[PDB]
Amino acid sequence: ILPVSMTKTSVDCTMYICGDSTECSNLLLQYGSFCTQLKRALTGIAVEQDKNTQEVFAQVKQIYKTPPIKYFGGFNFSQILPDPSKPSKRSFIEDLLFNKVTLKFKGLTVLPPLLTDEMIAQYTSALLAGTITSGWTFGAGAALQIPFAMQMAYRFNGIGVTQNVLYENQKLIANQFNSAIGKIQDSLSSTASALGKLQDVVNHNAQALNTLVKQLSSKFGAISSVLNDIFSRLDPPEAEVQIDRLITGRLQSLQTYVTQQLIRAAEIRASANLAATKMSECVLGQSKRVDFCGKGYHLMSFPQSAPHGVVFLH
Amino acid sequence: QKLIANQFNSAIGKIQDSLSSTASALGKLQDVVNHNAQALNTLVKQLSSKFGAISSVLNDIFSRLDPPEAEVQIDRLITGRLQSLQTYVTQQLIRAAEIRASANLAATKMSECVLGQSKRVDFCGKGYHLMSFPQSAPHGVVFLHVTYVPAQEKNFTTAPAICHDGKAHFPREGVFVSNGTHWFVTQRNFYEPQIITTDNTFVSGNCDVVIGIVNNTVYDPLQPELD
Amino acid sequence: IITTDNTFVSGNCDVVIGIVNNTVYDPLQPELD
Amino acid sequence: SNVFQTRAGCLIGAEYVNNSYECDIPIGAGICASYQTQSIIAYTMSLGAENSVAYSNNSIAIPTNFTISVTTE
């Protein structure tokens, strides 16, 4: 489970301060326009997660199309490939994951993901199709066709298994594969912690969000942290400068919040480079890496989406 | 040798045509500089930023207000300029770690791209990797990644097994093909006629598992020597 | 030693530049099989 | 001009086309833009050419050529 995106959040300046009160804007501009560069950094952030999605999901040349009939001359792949029968074209595992993971906010915005859930779903489907039908080459241009029995004979020679163990006994290894997949799906449905690293980040975000929410009452020296309370029971002469110190305080707060946001974004960035490297190696061939696509003499990996990340079934 | 060398020459021409036509493709290399300057800009902007003070410069407030009514304000000025600096340097560190990882990556690039060839499929440039040639930059590096991308795929006929005298045979390295009135053996990843000896087939199992397969004769490479 | 086993043939000896002519012996001959 | 409504919100000043084109300026929530040549069209981001690769069993398609391409990292 690799957190690959993050909620591309953003913060409006005046919507965060008070709304449309004019003393807010005048004290702001007298202080300065820091929130300009703050939201500059955040918009940056957002576009890096956009690029993370692009560089993790859609490295392929074009959107290789799967046949809806998951039949490849003796193989059934509806368990792994999506079937069009659902209103959403998603593989069963991805739907189990999205339902299994439970996911305009008063001054803070959650910009929508550019690559929509269905769109990232078609990326996943297409790259799955490339990996299975066309094989390892699909990341270097056209996804060249080649017969899967030959692909599997070649794979077994990769791990040093001859071709008679397959063309006579495809079924044993395939059934072990599918049964293990079934055990996986059972775990995923039943174990809510097996995907922790994908909602904790949201929790992080949430708590970070909560942090800025929580700070909204922190006062920093004077009596009342509500702008309207000061503007009401304090006369405008002093209310100006009291609102000014509050501006100072939550400016510090938002800066600190977005600094944690940047650092979390750096973590996301490392993880997303990780995800892209997995999406290359683990996906585009029998990966030589031994403990990078999962433990052991790694064979391959199948990705599925998540509300903000990816899941590689190694 | 010669024709691939010439196609590399064509790749060279593509290199120059792209680079002359792409002088701005250094965006990913140049943006950071702006950020630095931008960060610098920001710090300069905060020289003008009051941070709650009646002004943002030391000299004017010192000259206007004699110290006995200005020491505390001077000290707050000091603290605000400080906190600006620590914040700025904090983003400096964040980006510092960013480029830190980036150039760890870069050293890896030159190791597995310059000092060697990376088996990794999307690490040294797009797709299959041959080589990489570095170049300097005002603050970074450029890798001309020289990579492989196939094309022109056309259909021919292969076989999964050969039932020779009831014995299942499977290709060692290469596949059967037929170009017209003739059948030969080529390689798996590309097309080339090759020497047809016993070397291209190995026995594992029988041909009774797949019903109706054809029966074939594999000549001994020593019988023509025997006669 | 350059023998039939440890070498391959792909195209005639016109694609190599400045080629030289030499004799390479087939390993089957000493066995006389 | 014409006003379109997408999951990201309300796109005005864009003549929402339904046609498939490669994406240049991603507009949001899965929709991108292009230049009509005149006016600026917005559409559902044409995902790509759905290359339905042909699975094969007992015949192959050899890549008879290639390109030694060069990229700038």
3-state secondary structure A126-157: HHHHHHHHHCHHHHHCCCCCCCHHHHHHHHHH
What is the distance between the alpha carbons of residues A186 and A202, in angstroms, rounded to a whole number?
A: 24
**Cβ neighbour number for residue A37 with a 10 Å cutoff:** 18
Residues A273, B121, B118, CA angle at the centre, nearest 5°? 95
- Per the entry, the structure determination technique was cryo-EM
Is the Cβ–Cβ distance between B155 and D59 less than 8 Å? yes
**Are chains C and A touching, using the cut-off of 8 Å on CB pairs and a minimum of 3 such pairs?**
no
Write a three-state SS string for chain B.
Answer: CHHHHHHHHHHHHHHHHHHHHCCCCCHHHHHHHHHHHHHHHHHHHHHHCCCCCCCCCHHHHHHHCCHHHCHHHHHHHHHHHHHHHHHHHHHHHHHHHHHHHHHHHHHHHHHHHHCCCCCCCCCCCCCEEEEEEEECCCCCCEEEEEEEEEEEEEEECCCCCEEECCEEEEECCCEEEECCCCEEEECCCCCCCECCCHHHEEEEEECCCCCCCCECCCCCCCHHHHC
What's the resolution in A? 4.3
Between the alpha carbon of residue A51 and those of residues A69, A138, A307, B31, B215, the distances in Å are 33, 21, 16, 15, 56
Residues C28, B194: C-beta atoms closer than 8 Å: no
Q: Token match 């990882």: residue?
A: B101
Q: Which amino acid is at B53?
A: A
Q: Closest by alpha carbon to B193, among D62, A266, A48, A103?
A: D62
Distance CA A187, CA A80 (A): 16
Q: Are D28 and D6 in contact (CB under 8 A)?
A: yes
Q: Which two tokens stand for residue A187?
A: 């775990």
In SS3 terms, chain A reads as CEECCCCCEEECHHHHHCCCCHHHHHHHHHHCCHHHHHHHHHHHHHHHHHHHHHHHHCCCCCCEECCCCCECCCCECCCCCCCCCCCCCCCHHHHHHHHHCCCCECCEEECCCCCCHHHHHHHHHHHHHHHHHHCHHHHHCCCCCCCHHHHHHHHHHHCCCCCHHHHCCHHHHHHHHHHHHHHHHHHHHHCCCCCHHHHHHHHHHHHHHHHHHHHCCCCCCCCCCCHHHHHHHCCHHHHHHHHHHHHHHHHHHHHHHHHHHHHHHHHHHHHHHHHHHHHHHCCCCCCCCCCCCCCCCCCCCEEEECCCEEEEEC
Please provide the DSSP assignment of C1-33 as one string. Answer: ---STT----S-TTSSTT--------THHHHT-
Dist CA B94 CA A266 (whole Å)? 8
* Residue whose token pair is 């603290």: B79
Within 10 angstroms of residue A272's Cβ, the number of other Cβ atoms is 26
Taking the CA atoms of residue A109, residue A114, residue A115 and residue A117 in that order, the dihedral angle to the nearest 10 degrees is 40
CB of D20 closer than 8 Å to CB of D43: yes
CB-based contact A8:A46 (threshold 8 Å)? yes
C28 vs B222: CB contact, 8 Å cut-off?
Answer: yes
Look at residues A306, A309, A305 and name the one whose alpha carbon lies nearest to residue A127: A305
The residue of chain C with its CA nearest to that of B187 is C10
B-chain residue closest to D61, CA distance: B155
Rounded to whole angstroms, the Cα distance separating A282 from A197 reads 20
CB atoms inside a 10 Å sphere around CB D9 = 12
- The DSSP annotation for chain D comes to ---EEETTEEE-S-EE--S----SEEEETTEEEEE----EEEEE------EE----SS-EEEEEEEEEEEEE-
Sheet holding A309-313, edge to edge: A2-3, A309-313, A302-305
Long-range contacts of A130-135 (CB under 8 A, 24+ apart): A130/A60, A130/A64, A130/D53, A131/A283, A131/A284, A131/A300, A131/A302, A132/A72, A132/A77, A132/A81, A133/A64, A133/A66, A133/A72, A133/D53, A133/D54, A133/D55, A134/A64, A134/D53, A135/A285
B226 interfacial to chain C (CB closer than 8 Å): yes
Nearest to B52 among A244, A259, A266 (CB): A244
D56 is written with which tokens?
A: 């094969």
Q: What's the CA gap between C3 and A123, in Å, rounded?
A: 51
What's the rounded Cα separation, in Å, for the pair A91 and A79?
A: 7
CA distance D42 to D17: 6
- Residue A130 has which token pair? 């490339």
Structure tokens at B90: 């904090």
The Cα angle at residue A120 between residues A114 and A126, in degrees rounded to 5: 140
Task: Determine the distance in angstroms separating the CA of C7 from the nearest CA of chain B, rounded to an integer.
Answer: 11
Q: With contact defined as beta carbons under 8 Å apart, do B193 and B223 qualify? A: no
Say if residue A186 is exposed, middle or buried (CB neighbours under 10 Å; 0-12, 13-18, 19+).
Answer: exposed
- Using alpha carbons, list the distances in angstroms from residue A274 to A2, A124, A262, B101: 8, 17, 18, 12
CA distances from D44 to A111, A187, C8, D25, D28 (A): 18, 36, 55, 12, 9
CB contact under 8 A, B153 and D67: no
- Angle between helix A170-190 and helix A92-100 axes, rounded to 10 deg: 20
**Residues written for chain C:** 33
Is residue A314 exposed (0-12), middle (13-18) or buried (19+ Cβ within 10 Å)? Answer: middle
Report how far residue D63's alpha carbon sits from residue A144's, in angstroms, rounded to the nearest whole number: 8
Q: Which of B97, B121, B148 is opposite residue A280, by nearest beta carbon?
A: B121
| Cα(B162)–Cα(B164) distance, integer angstroms | 6
Alpha-carbon gap, residue B109 to B95, rounded angstroms: 20
d(CA B186, CA B172): 11
CA–CA separation, B164 and B207 (whole Å)? 8
Contact yes or no for D49 and A62 at CB 8 A: yes
Per the CB < 8 A criterion, the answer to whether B83 and A67 are in contact is no
Q: Does B88 touch chain A (CB under 8 A)?
A: no
Q: How long is chain B?
A: 227
| CA dist., res. A248 & res. A284, Å (int) | 52
Closest Cα of chain B to C23: distance in Å?
19
Cross-chain Cβ contact A150/B51 below 8 Å: no
Q: Do the beta carbons of residue D63 and residue B151 sit within 8 Å?
A: yes
AA letter at A275: A
